[PDB]
């Protein structure tokens, strides 16, 4: 249930959400081994963020939230704390994506999972 997160990605990066699915070793469902670059670390951190929310009793993969973007930044909202927490994880990730746009490399979109090697860093 991630059309809102995709919308946030596009608003913050100028790229389609498609460009962040399968990116490196962590962007897209699950993920393992060592992140390829800073954008991939964003996704590793986002996965960690969701894990924390699942241990709080939230379902961040499913939560529907509200948000806006002014010049003052990203404003998160929602009826429940779990929806607002989900928005906060997404926000940190979208901001992280924007921040590392300088090292975004297209060779890592749709990265073959066999090329993911090394240890898996902890959260
Ligand atoms: C960037 C990203 C994700 C991450 O931020 C991440 N850390 O793995 C992500 C994702 O991560 C959450 C998780 O695995 O806990 C699950 C599914 C798609 C994901 N995507 C791609 C994505 C995001 C929003 C809307 C659509 C898509 C998407 C685009 C094309 C095909 C499939 C999904
Ligand atoms: Ca992931
Ligand atoms: Cl985080
Ligand atoms: Cl609701």
The reply to whether ligand 1 has any atom less than 6 angstroms from the CB of 26 is yes
Q: How far is the CA of 23 from the centre of ligand 2 (A)?
A: 9
Q: Which residues keep their CB under 5 angstroms from ion ligand 2? A: 26, 31, 47
Measured in angstroms, the resolution is 2.2
Letter string b/e over residues 13-50, b meaning 16 or more CB atoms within 10 A of that residue's CB: beeeeebbebbbbbbeeebebbbbbbbbbbbbbbbebb
Q: Where are the beta strands (DSSP E) in the chain?
A: 66-69, 74-77
Q: Give the determination technique.
A: X-ray
90 flagged as catalytic: yes
Q: What is the CATH number of the domain that holds 16?
A: 1.20.90.10
Ramachandran sector of residue 74 (left: φ over 0; alpha: ψ -120 to 50; beta: rest): beta
The reply to whether ligand 1 has any atom less than 6 angstroms from the CB of 21 is yes
Domain range for 19 is 1-123
Question: Number of structural domains, the chain?
Answer: 1
40 flagged as catalytic: no
């Amino acid at each position: 249930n991630l059309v809102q997160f995709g919308v946030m990605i596009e608003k913050m990066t100028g790229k389609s959400a498609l460009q962040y699915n399968d990116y490196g070793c962590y962007c897209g469902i699950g993920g393992s081994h060592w992140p390829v670059d800073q954008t991939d670390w964003c996704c590793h951190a986002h996965d960690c963020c969701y894990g924390r929310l699942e241990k709080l009793g939230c379902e961040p993969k499913l939560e529907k939230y509200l948000f806006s973007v002014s010049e003052r930044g990203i404003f998160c909202a929602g009826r429940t704390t779990c929806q607002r927490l989900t928005c906060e994880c997404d926000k940190r990730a979208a901001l992280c994506f924007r921040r590392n746009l300088g090292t975004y490399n297209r060779k890592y979109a749709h990265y073959p999972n066999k090329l993911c090697t090394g240890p898996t860093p902890p959260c």
